[PDB]
C-alpha cells in the first residue's frame, strides 16, 4: 500500500511509484498505448512495463540524500533519492547511471544507460523540475504536488529519464519498454512528451 | 539573424508563393491568423523561424516575402483566401495591365513602371536582417512578368546590393507540351540576360513532375497544387539546415562553392527521393541506400533530360530524418565511376553532404505520407547541353520565317537582341562542351 | 589505373557490407537467442 | 454466387492436472508413516540414486598423512 | 601449462563438441553461467588447461566453433551450455557449402580462413604452453571436410613440431547418407596421410550398436550417441587433467602406438559399458573392463579384429586400482589369443593411470588402438570411387570451382599404397 | 539471415501462390492482415520467418516473392480477396492481354514490353537478401504466360546473377488429360531453352494428384484448391530446414548437389508420403517404415510412369517431427534387399537425410489429418524417358501435316525454332539410353 498525500505535495518517506503519463503523440509509429510504469527488471537492469498497480516491484520509497528528515516537503530542483526495496531482506537499491563511454551503452539503443546498484555515491541523486521552459526559474524550489507531469533530471549529467517507447524489450514478463537517460528538445527547443514522468501515490 | 528572403515573380510566383508558404506555416507552428496558438509551449529565446518569419511584439509573424504580378486576378485569390490575415498587404505587388506573353512589354514598357515600388519594398525587408543569406527567385520563363520583369529585377539587384546571394528556381518550358507558342523568345532572351546576373540555379520542366506522379503514386488526374506541393517539399530541403540543427550543416552560401566550377556554369538539376504513396509507405520499408538510388534513377528527375548522356560535374546531398553518417557514407561509396553513373576526371572527390535531424513534415490534403528519410540532390551534368539544343532548335525555326517579331520591336525595344541571344547560346553550348572534356 | 581505383572502392564497399552482416549477427545474436533458452526453461 | 478462391480463402479466414505450479507448495508430502527401507522395505522409491561426486583425495594424499600426530608448528620467526 | 586447442568446423563438428564441452563442464564441475561450483580443490588446480581465466572469476574455453554459415551456431548458443562459449568465437561465411569438397577447399570454405587464422594466432600463441592441436572435421560433407581439413593442411605448415590428432567421422557402412561421400572422403584421405599423425575413426551405425546391444535403449538420439564421442576426447587426456600415480600424455602414446609416418590409422574404444537397470548387479572390477574392451561390439570404427591383426593398443585407467592384477589380465590377452597380434613385436599395451574417475563413475578406462583391419574401412570407399569415376558421374560439381582431375587421379594412388602397406602386416 | 525469393508465373502461379503462400502465413504466427499476434514461435522466430516476412515501422510483415502474369483477370482475385492488405502493391505485376497458348507472343511481343518493370522489383527486393542461394520457379509448360514469359526470364537471370541456383516446382502437362490441345508446341520449345539454363526440375502433374485424392484421401469430385495444398505442402517441407530447428538443418545447395549428376540430365520426380484423410488416420497406424515404403510403391508418385521399367538413380529424404534416427537407418536398410527396386551401378551411395523438429502444421479446413511424421523423397529417375517420349511422339505426328504453325511464324519466330527443338530432343533420347546403360 502506498502513502496518501494530505496536502497535494509529496513528502519524503512516502511510498510512491513512478509512471510516465499517456502520450497523444504519433510521430514514433511504434507505440505502447498508455501510462507506462517503471519497474525493476532482471534477466539487474531497469525498464518500464505496461501500466501496473503498486506491486512492490514498482514501489519507490522516497529517501533523503542531503540528510533530510522522514517527513519533509520536497521542492523542484532539489536532490533526493528514490529507493526500491529488494524482494528478500535487501535494504536499499539506487537508481543509477554513468557518464557515457564506449562500453557502458544502453541496451537496444546506444545511449546513456540507467540501472540498479547497491553502492552509494552522488550518481544516485535526482532532482525533478518544471516542464515549461519559461517558468522553471519562477517555480524553482517550490513544493511539488502528487500526480503531475514533471521531468526527472540527474545532478551529475543534467540529462533526463526518457520514455523510449519506440523499442520493445521482451522480458520474462513480456510487457515491454526501454528506459534510458537523455534530454530531448523540439524545433522550438522545448521538452518533449518523451521525457515526462509522474510520481503516483 | 540568418535571414533569407523569398522573391516570387509571376502568377506562377503566386501559385508557388501559396503552396510553399503553407508548408512553412505548418513546418513551424504557425496558424493562418499568423500567431501560434496559445497553449503552445516555446521557451522564447530560441527561435527557429527567424530566417523567414519576422516578428512584432505581440507575436505576429509576417513573412519576409514579396510577390510580383501584373494582373490582379491571381493575388486577389491570396488577398481574400484562407491566409488573408497572415500576408501584410504591402508585400503583394500588382500591376494593372499584364505583359501578356512577351518580353519588351515587361522589360521596357510595362514592367518599367513597376520596378519603382518593388525596389522600395525590398529595402524595407532587407534592412531588418542582420545577416541576409540570400534572396530566392521563383519565376516562370513563359509569361511576360516571369521573363521580362524578372531579368530587370536581376540587373538592378546587382547594382543595389553587389554580391549577395540571388538563387533562382526557374520554371523552364517543357520540351513537348507548353502553355503557349511564343514562349522560346521569352525563354532565351532572359537566359542570355540572366547569365552574369545569377549566382546559382535549378531547373524544372512541368511535364516531368507529371511523369513522376502517375508512375510513382496513384494520384490520377493531378493538379498544379499536387505539383506545387512537391515544389514546397524541395525548397524546404534546400533551407532545411538553416533553421534546424544537424550532424552537418549546409548554408545558402554553400551550393555555389561546391557546384559552380565557373561563374557562368551554374545550372544544376533538382530531385526529391522518397516519392511513394500513403498506402505504399506502410508496406515497403526504406533505407538510406534505397532513397539514394532513386535520385540516381532517371524516373525521379524533375526534368525531361537524362544524365546518362552526360557527366556528373558535381553533386550536393541533403539528407533528413533518422540517417546515420555511417550509412549515408556507404551508398555514396557504393556508387561509382564505372556504372551508368560516370564522373568527370577533374572532379575526383565529387560530393557534398548535409545532414538534418528534423524529419519532413506532412501537409493536409497532399499525397505523400509520414516518410522518415529523404534526399535533395542537385547534380550538375553536361547533359543540359541537349536541353539548350532543343530550344535552339525551336527558336531559330520560329526565327527562320521571322514570326511574332512585330510584337517585340515596337515595345520600346531595339532589333539586334534576337541576333545576339542566338549567338550567346552558341558559345555557351561550346562552353558546356569543353567543361566536360577528358584531360589532354 | 582508373580500373585500379574503381575496383579499390569496390573492395572498400564489399568490406563494409561484410562487416555489417558480421556485427549485426553478433549483437542481435544475443538479442534473439535469449528466447529459446526461455522456452526450454 | 462467389468464386472458389474467395470461398476457400474465406473459409481459411473463418478458420488439467491437480497439482499445478500454484498448487505445488500446499500439497504436502511425507505423511501416514509408511515403512522406509530398501530391499523389501516396501516404501515408495526414496531418494536413493548413486549420486555423482568427485573423490577429493588421491593415493598420495591419503597414505602420506602425518605418521604420528604432533602439534603443527608456529611461524618460523618474527 | 600444457593446454589443448579445441578445433572444429561444419555442423557435424559443432554438434559433436557441443557434448565434449558438456563433460569437461561436468567433470571439472562448471556451471553453464561462467563460474565454478565444484566439490574439491583438485579440479581447480589444473583448470587453465581447458578454460582461460578473466575478470569475474569466470572460465571461457579455447573454443573454436566454425561453420560456413550461421546455420548451426544458432543452436549451440541456445543449447543448455551456451553462455560459456565466447561471442567472438563463431566464425562464419554466408552461403553454406553443401556436399562438395572444392567450394570447401578452394572458394567458399577457403575464403573465410583469415578469421580462423586470426583466432588461433591470437589465442594459441598467447597460451603459455600449448600441447598440440585437436580437430574434428565432418569428413563426409562439404564444410568440415572442406574448410577444417584445409586448416589441418595449413597450421601444420606453421608449427611442424607439435602433435596432430583427429576424431574423424568416416562414412557409415550399410546405409549411406550423401552421394558425394565417395569423393569428399576419398579426397580428404589424400590430405590426411601427410598432414595427420593420429586419426581416430567414428561411425554412427557402429555407435547405434551400443545403445541397442549394450546400453539398452529403444530410442537413441544424437545427445546419446555423442557422449561416447566425448569419451574418446575427454578421457584420453586424463594424465594432464589430474594428478596421481603415473602420468603418460598424448605425445607419450603416439610413440607407443604408431611405428611409422604412413601408419596413424587408429581404432578407438571405451570400457565401462552395460545396461541401465543392471547397474547394481555387475561388479565394476579389474576383470570386467579387460573382458569388455577387446571384443568387436565395444569398438567404434565398424570393422572386425578377427580378419586381421592388431599392432598396438593403449589404455588409460582411472581410480584407485591394483597394478598387479591388471597386468596379469593384459599379459594373458597378449598370449591366449596369440593370433591377433604380430609376433615380431614384443608387447603392445601401454598402461597409464590417474587418480579420479569421471564423475558418477568409480573405476574407469578408455581405449586407443592401431589395427590393420581398418584397411577394410578404406577399401569400401575405394570400392565406391572406382564404380563412379569410370562413368565420370557427378563430376561437374568438382571442376566448377577450379579443381582438375589430377586431384582425382592421385586420390586413389594414395588409397592404393596405403592398403598396400597393411597387406604385408597381415 | 536466410531467404527465399520464390517466383510464381501465371494463372498457374497465382492460384498456386494463393495456396502456397497461404501456408507461410499459417506456419508462422502471421495473421492475414500483415501483423503478428506476438505469440512466440517454436525455437527462434525472428530468424525463422525472415526467409519470407520482413519488418517496417508498423510491425507489418510483407512477403518477398513475386507473382507475374499477362492479365489482371486472375491476379485481381488476390487483389480482391482475403489477403489483400498483406501483399505489396507493386509485387504483383500485371498485364493486359494474355499470351493465349502461344510461345510466339509470350516470349517476344507480349514478353519484352513488360519484362522491365519486374526487374526493378527483384533488384529492389534482393538488396536485403543476405542468405539466399538461388531462385525457385513455379511455371507451366503447357500455357502461354507460364512458358513464354518465363523462359524469357530464364535466359536473362543466368546472364545477370551468374552461377546461382535454379530449381523448378514446375507444372508438367499431363499424360492423358488434355486441357489445351497444341500444348506440345509450348512445352517442347520451352524445354529447348530452359534445359541448358536451369539445374533441377521438380516435376508434378494434375491428373496424378487427382488419382491420389480419390484413393488415399476419399474425396469425390475435387478442385484445384483441393489439389493445390498437396503441392503447397511439398514446397513447405523442402523449405523446412532453414526455418525450424532440428538435428539436421539442410542448406539450399544440398538439393541440387545430390539430385543431379550431369548438365543435361536434371529431371527428378516428386513424392510426398503421409497422404491420408482427416478422420480415418487414427484407425490406421503411422509407422516410419510405412511412411518410408509408401513412396517407392508407384501409386504415390506424382508422375504417371513406372520405375519397374527403368531405374532409380539418385534420391533424397526430409523427415520432420518425431523422428528417431535409428528407425531411419533400419527402414532404408530394407530397400537394399530389392531387385524390383533397381539402381544403376554408378550411384552406390544413393541417399540424403534432412531432419527438423516441427510436426507438419495442417491448414484448417483441409483434407489431411494432423500428421506428425512426414517425408518427401524428391528423387531422380531415368523412367521419365518414357514420360518425355510421349510429349515427343505426338509432336512428330503433328508436324508431318505442318498444322497449327501459322500463328507461330507470325510473331517473331522462324520455322527453324521448330526443327532444333526436335534436334535437341533427339540427342536427349540418345542420352538417357546411355545414362542408364550398365557397365560390364
Ligand atoms: N511547373 C509549374 N509551372 C507552373 C505552375 N504554375 C504556373 N506555371 C507555369 O506558369 C506559366 C504561366 O505564365 P506566367 O508567367 O505565370 O503568367 P504571368 O506571370 O501573369 O505572365 P503573363 O501571362 O505574360 O502576364 C505557364 O508556363 C505555366 O506552366 C506550377 O505550379 N508548376
Ligand atoms: N491442378 C492444377 N492445375 C493448374 C493450376 N493452375 C494452373 N493449372 C494448369 O495450368 C494450365 C492452365 O494454362 P495457363 O496456366 O492458364 O496458361 P498460361 O501460362 O497462364 O498462359 P495464358 O493462359 O495465355 O495466360 C492448365 O493445364 C491447368 O490445369 C492449379 O492450381 N492446379
Ligand atoms: N555423431 C554425430 N554425427 C553427426 C552429427 N551431426 C551430423 N552428423 C553426421 O555428419 C554428416 C553431416 O555432414 P555435414 O555436417 O552436413 O557436412 P558439412 O557440410 O561438411 O558440414 C551426416 O552424415 C551426419 O550423420 C552429430 O551431432 N553427431
Ligand atoms: Mg503576368
Ligand atoms: Mg494469363
Author numbering:
A (entry chain F): 55 to 97, 111 to 268
B (entry chain MK), F (entry chain JK): 1 to 440
C (entry chain C): 11 to 51
D (entry chain 7): 89 to 103, 112 to 174
E (entry chain JL): 1 to 426
Q: What does the published report state?
A:
Motile cilia are eukaryotic organelles responsible for cellular locomotion and movement of extracellular fluids. The beat of motile cilia is generated by the axoneme, a circular arrangement of dynein-decorated doublet microtubules (DMTs). To address these questions, we used cryo-EM to build an atomic model of DMTs isolated from bovine respiratory cilia, a paradigm for all motile cilia with 9+2 axonemes. The structure identifies MIPs specific to vertebrate axonemes, a pentameric ODA-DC, and a mechanism that links the internal and external periodicities that, when disrupted genetically, causes impaired ciliary motility in the LRO and alteration in the chirality of visceral organs.
Five cryo-EM datasets were processed to determine the structure of the 48-nm repeat of the bovine DMT to a nominal resolution of 3.4 Å and a local resolution range of 3.2–4.0 Å. Of the identified 29 MIPs, 22 have orthologs in the atomic model of the Chlamydomonas DMT. The seven additional MIPs include four tektins (described below), C19orf71, EFCAB6, and FAM166B. Our structure conclusively places bovine tektins at the ribbon (protofilaments A10-A01) of the A tubule, which is consistent with their expected location in sea urchin sperm but inconsistent with their localization to the Chlamydomonas B tubule. At the center of the tektin bundle is C19orf71, a relatively unstructured protein we identified by denaturing the microtubule and performing mass spectrometry on the tektin-enriched sample. Our cryo-EM maps revealed the mammalian ODA-DC as a wave-like structure with 24-nm periodicity on the outside of protofilaments A07 and A08. The improved map quality allowed identification of five subunits: CCDC114, CCDC151, ARMC4, TTC25, and Calaxin (renamed from EFCAB1). The ODA-DC is linked to the internal MIP structure through two paralogous MIPs (Pierce1 and C15orf65).
